[PDB]
Amino acid sequence: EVQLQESGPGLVKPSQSLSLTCTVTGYSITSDYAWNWLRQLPGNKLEWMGYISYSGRIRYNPSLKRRISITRDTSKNQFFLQLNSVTTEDTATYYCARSDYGNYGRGDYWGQGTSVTVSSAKTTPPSVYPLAPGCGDTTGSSVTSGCLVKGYFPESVTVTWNSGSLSSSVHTFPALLQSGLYTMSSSVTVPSSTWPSETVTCSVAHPASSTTVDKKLEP
Amino acid sequence: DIQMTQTTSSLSASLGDRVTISCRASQDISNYLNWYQQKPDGTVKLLIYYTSRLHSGVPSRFSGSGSGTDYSLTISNLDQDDIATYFCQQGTTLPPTFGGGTKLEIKRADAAPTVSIFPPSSEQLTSGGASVVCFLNNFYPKDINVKWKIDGSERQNGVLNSWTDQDSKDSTYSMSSTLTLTKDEYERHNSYTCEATHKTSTSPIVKSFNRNE
Ligand SMILES: O=C(O)CCCC(=O)Nc1ccc(/C=C/c2ccccc2)cc1
The missing domain is CATH 2.60.40.10 (Immunoglobulins)
Known part of the structure; x- marks a missing residue:
């Protein structure tokens, strides 16, 4: 203790x-x-x-x-x-x-x-971009979506997901320095029968800058 | 300073196996040697002190031996939870000094990566940037190659790769590959391809999209 x-x-x-x-x-x-x-x-x-x-x-x-x-x-x-x-x-x-x-x-x-x-270097908030499959990209059994968190400083960043089904595998990729600034990304996999039916949004918090953004993922 | 050397930095073994990790000191340290486990999140735990004594709580499959300058940690009946980095430390004189550590990977059945590609977003393009992204998820072994092709022509410059730590539960690896060009470069070409080459397959796994669709 x-x-x-x-x-x-x-x-x-x-x-x-x-x-x-x-x-x-x-x-x-x-x-x-x-x-x-x-x-x-x-x-x-x-x-x-x-x-x-x-x-x-x-x-x-x-x-x-x-x-x-x-x-x-x-x-x-x-x-x-x-x-x-x-x-x-x-x-x-x-x-x-x-x-x-x-x-x-x-x-x-x-x-x-x-x-x-x-x-x-100056403390900079991240830009948050949705990662959804291209239009002609017809899929199968499940679907992988993501967010790209680019151009921030310093580390770290937290990415959390909300979707509806507790069969969500999340992966959080470590950030890399892209010419002075940090870039990372995160993926989530949900069954194909839950998206785009049920809304999926990623939440990106950056405490250094005390910012939080939510991107909804669109087909 | 007493210099502590762990000649092996990487180790890969199967569940149930017995692994030995070795530690050497620049002078005699009379058995004042301790062993620590650092998990990938950075948490650190004391395993064994004074060469072979177990710290309270540590399972009995951890054991240690050695004298003089040479010491060894032995982990037997190897467990899924033991994915970690293992450090030694001399406790005989100031400053206390540590070995460089040995990373331990748990072997697993070969698995092919589930590959996905994504075009630049609506919003990013308005900003004047354009990042194409590729996820290669849940594969083993770690070693893998990704090739981007823009209108068939290979692209080496402006690509960022990022591996996850070995998954603590299933032993898989995942990787993201990111090609960053300008909006105008992006809009000068039709097709964007992501090619994964991995031990699990003789021919690469190919995913792409075309902008004209
Ligand atoms: O200089 C000498 O030879 C002996 C001086 C007495 C002394 O402070 N000994 C001594 C003091 C502190 C340590 C600390 C070791 C340690 C090891 C790991 C993490 C944090 C601390 C180890 C040894």
Whole structure:
């Protein structure tokens, strides 16, 4: 029942500082253990950043000691990461974790990870386009429809579907960078006897821009 | 820093099988070695600490061995849930350091992709863009090739491909292919084809539409 979760901005400009919080519940950060910041860069290469012990002792990875600072607030049962002078190299998934303070050195509980992007690029909402079969494209047993989410920044985006039949297989394809901006897509497969009879619409949320659009799919 | 090396980054095995994943350290770490499971959503779980001791909750089909610099994780009676990346970590000195991980794929029966093509939308065309899209859904094995042809002529430039993670329940892969050209380029040609070449078939799977229809 120990739980950690990291929060903080998902987009930071080059040369500024990155700030994150880890909220701990079900255990007190003063009782025992070390409280760690880690990060995983593009290519899945995992890197320990530092800790604050339950007694307030602090240690840092030598590659980052010049730019890093970990603090705690025992009143809120939270610990914090500040990393200064960030560049694109600091784009990563950031993790908090509880570990043994010495002995076996095992990290026994981890947060889910939060994604931080370091770029000067502007926050842009997505364009959402319906994907329906062409007119002369007579089909068979079931029908695949989709949405194209193009030209947004930063990641991430959520695509949810509503149709009527719980025999809907959804696929969500990871986004790619198309010349500065992100593009992704999602598909849904429904029986041919439910569409175009029953309405199908995709919902695309983009929290960075706090936008939500719904495209109805038309034959 | 102690450098941790997992020489194998990719591994593919069948359900029930036994798999061994190896980890090596740049110096002697006296059995202070831990193993972790990272699921594709990024969730991380401790499996084994101090070479061979099970973390609370972990099934007994996970086990570990080793001494000195060489260590191994053994997963036997391999399960559908074990699709993950497996990382080692030395716990003897600061900074704590991790291996690059070994990705594990669960084998499955060969399956041919269900292919679909979509023309540019009404709305997109008004914007002056034109994206043709192709879904190749629910195939195995992962390796697959997609060829776009515009009026029969092959198109390599302006194509984006995106594979999903191995499906956690059925072990299939899916892929989207996206050809992006300008509205004017798009409107200069009649036929648009999407050709899937996969192990499951000797001849490609072809889907297309014609604008003059
Ligand atoms: O420098 C030394 O040799 C010993 C200093 C004592 C010490 O802090 N040991 C120690 C402290 C913390 C760890 C943490 C390991 C860890 C591993 C995975 C995730 C999060 C943390 C591992 C070892």
